[model samples]
Target: SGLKKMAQPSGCVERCVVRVCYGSTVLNGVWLGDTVTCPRHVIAPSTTVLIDYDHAYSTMRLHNFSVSHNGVFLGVVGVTMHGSVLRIKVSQSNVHTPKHVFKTLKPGDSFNILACYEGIASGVFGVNLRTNFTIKGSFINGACGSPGYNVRNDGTVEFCYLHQIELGSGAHVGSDFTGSVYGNFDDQPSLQVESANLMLSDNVVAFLYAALLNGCRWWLCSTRVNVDGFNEWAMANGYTSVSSVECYSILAAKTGVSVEQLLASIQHLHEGFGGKNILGYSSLCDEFTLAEVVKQMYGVN
Candidate 1:
């Protein structure tokens, strides 16, 4: 639990800036308050402060916004529209003091600036702060080549347009993924198949296996049944580069369907639709009709 304050102005300021920050990282904007002329401005007597320490490895989850020795909260500060500024009052202030102090600064104005943060690595400092924050802007500059980012005046950051992505070679999911997969312009090892049925639903695998077996029925049944036609068909359909006959055979074996039944579906589609040309193009065949046959063949629930 903490305090928060809200302030308003009757007239506008020319270059008024409001900002929020934690440690060396600024949260909201570049400027702390606005710089302009105004007759009336808003100010609050007191408010609550809320501190959030969000880090992947953070173990602190207390509702009170817990902080360790290296973890300390620097309260928030903000300026109103017309140049009026205020800072959140620190309750148990443990942060180091700044080197130089402003002569014109008062008790309730400005932040408790730090000279150096001596906290250990990856530590969080939580603090309660209250202020009338003017949060607005985009990033000043950002890109993939550069390592850092800068926000714009409106408290936002825009990204550069992407023409294409160059995903360097050999990027693949771990062994956990054994389902049917697809590839594009990227190359793959012979062992990396485009599709696998280990993780797919029985019905989906049945459909895929039936389709492939149907497309390459003669090659699978003939003595010339090598890895060529089945692999070509697999790549065209969205499988990675790998031998597919073995995988389809295993699926056929497990699903109680002979290679012949799977083979017959393609001929069935070809006969029902107009000719072998229709069977040649998998897209022309009605997917619903194929799925219906697959459901019948696999007894999919």
Candidate 2:
């Protein structure tokens, strides 16, 4: 979560030379054992953030101090005490604000207030980028749609939406049934009737079938778009080594399906719908949009 002590605190009084060695070996991790009078803290961060934003520009003020002993120089101190402007910008398409903005300002600062437009009423949208040192309040873009927040920015206390899986929260639908069955003997006495059983529930099976037949199509399309966006971002950021096959393997693993199974799901989309509903079959990139294939397979009409 924050800094961690690497070596315990210790001190020496008289003139005693102390030497410390910090190095790493191939077999072991970094060795930070030997220390002097003062303890050193290592940066061990465990970060979780809701919102983040890009800082277009920033300006700060600094304070410098010096310590003296009997008019002899001891040490100097430097601190960032204040700043005029610390600009933070957000994008409309991005979700979960960046982590940098949240930490830039400390607690107990006057500008530490967090606010958002909690309604659909439109007028002047604004954000007060406040911290202990500075307050850069300004109205943002003019339109306010549905209530939303900057996922990249916030405090320790947060507001979140309810998940879709809560029970008795209008999530589960359909019926439930349970009964017993028994066998009957034949009158002939030579033959005995065999036991038979049947079971039914208006639960997941119905929903599963429905999704398989219809929703699976759109679901796959969305997945394809998401994957495409990811791949584009990776490429733009110079992560050229990423492969669609690797992504497909990951998605397949997530859905408890094998890579071969995923391939099979998408490979047959071309021949469906009398060739009229051919999916996003790309021969140039040798890629089939998984979303399209899913839609084609589960699509009604």
Candidate 3:
């Protein structure tokens, strides 16, 4: 059986580093230390493992920083500033966002933001990504989603405030959950995506699921056929099926481009409107074009 224990820590700290080492060498089954590892390192806390300090200011402090799994080279979780003054630049080399970074995080005991998961992958690490505290947020977000944050997966992001969160293109893109935001933004907490045999559910975002999820898919598809005139062009180009999903994804990575710009640019590309390569990637080097798959069931346009 796995040993499960919880400790209550006094509220405090400015810049403190808490590291969990394997608690294999304990005396009389009693641990005596500021920080000790869990049983066989088998006591995996589904959320974050190694916790560190970002920037500690007043009692309600906002820190500007970036997060990578395993202390290095995991994936790129979109960057958000605490005060709009914090500038974040995500180097392109890393883009794979870890599911646990947002789950395993703790901002001392005084204030709680969101827990971030620290596990990078499964083979090299063992971690539980589920929790009771998944749906979290606050009312402070002006335009962004509650928690105004990026979540990869595994942990719950509940109990925060929500105004409106519009995820930018190429923002918070990852494997754990593709339509994750669709459910959240839709406010359809009871909505579930049946991938294979798994029924993943989010109860907090029950209200706005249809529009966000349905609309996003619809807009992209329409643009490809109408603006990009991809349907016409693909036929001329001798393509039997010019899926909007396949067309605008011409040859480039989608980043930094606004939804409007992305649509316009993609449309223009097909019509030869913008000189700038609509497709972020170069077609000369690549073999196939990949775009988001349209979700047709929602009937959004």
Candidate 4:
């Protein structure tokens, strides 16, 4: 068989946001509404990369990270530090790539990946980070000395903090399953126009921004791009969208930078490599920028 089943992790997680992509909610349960709660939420439809060094430092080592794809369970891989170089100890690899590929992965290397599989024929592209990505639990560093971080049936994509994915045309960064560094079929599905359009879509971007704003922890709202409607959801509960000017004015209250300066800074980030920031509390400050972005994105000021 070319593929295999990984596993499910436990204990470390008590509650989480269930995610189902291009799907609807499950009724006949608690929390009657368009949205509900779950100890573990995932796309019931079924199916479904890189590490950095210095980043790992002393903060996280010798921990097992739970990995998933499009809500499908993959095996757990251990993070073992060898002189500040993070190496994945693979008992049963959670990824489709040959376990040896990880074994050969150089330290501190990351990628913007694109790969296709059975359930995910459309493929997905994402980058690597150094934190637990499950939104409901905020499992950052909680995986310390456990079987693996607890992230159940969670639907957030790119849940693993340290995995390697490379965007190379006919390139193999490491050895393949056949133990050949250069396999004849090394050149796989390189890229597609859809892949580019897919990555830039508002759904993934909003989910990403939501995760980044939450410090890489996936939030319930993160998954809702325009498809679910933050504008409607926020308004339906009981309020109106704030005005653009008033929204920025309130966001800049008491912050050292003037409203104009904050807007400029945000524009600077958005224009370049890009973002939009600065908040009074600074806690979840990334959210400050997010709230600002959401204002224009949804007019839910």
Best by TM-score: 1
The TM-score of predicted model 1 comes to 0.19
lDDT of each: 0.24, 0.20, 0.21, 0.24
Candidate 4, position 240, lDDT: 22
RMSD of 3: 21.0
RMSD of each: 24.7, 28.9, 21.0, 20.9
lDDT of 3 at 195: 17
Q: Using TM-score, rank the candidates from best to worst.
A: 1, 4, 3, 2
* Candidate 4 Cα errors over 4 Å, as ranges: 1-28, 31-243, 251-253, 271-301
lDDT tens per residue, model 4, 1-301: 1111112222111121112111332211001112111111111222122223335333443232333334644332433333211233333332222111122221111222222221221222322211111111111111111111112233222222211112233112222122222111121223411111111112222223333333442121212123224334324432122223343333234232233333223222333331432221222222123332343234432
Q: Name the 10 consecutive residues with the lowest summed lDDT in model 4.
A: 27-36
Stretches of model 1 off by over 4 angstroms after superposition = 1-60, 64-205, 208-225, 232-238, 242-301
True-vs-predicted CA distance for residue 284, candidate 3, Å: 16
The ten-residue window of minimal lDDT in model 3 covers 25-34
- Flag regions of model 2 displaced more than 4 Å: 1-254, 270-301
Please write out the lDDT profile of model 1 over residues 1-301, one tens digit for every residue: 1111111110111011122222222212111122111101012111133212122113321232211222334332222221121122323332222121112211112111111122211111111111111111111211101101112234332111100111223222110011111122111122332222111122223444554445533312222323454345444443322323444555556544554443334323323334333225433222221223433345335
- The superposed Cα distance between candidate 1 and the true structure at residue 20, in angstroms, equals 26
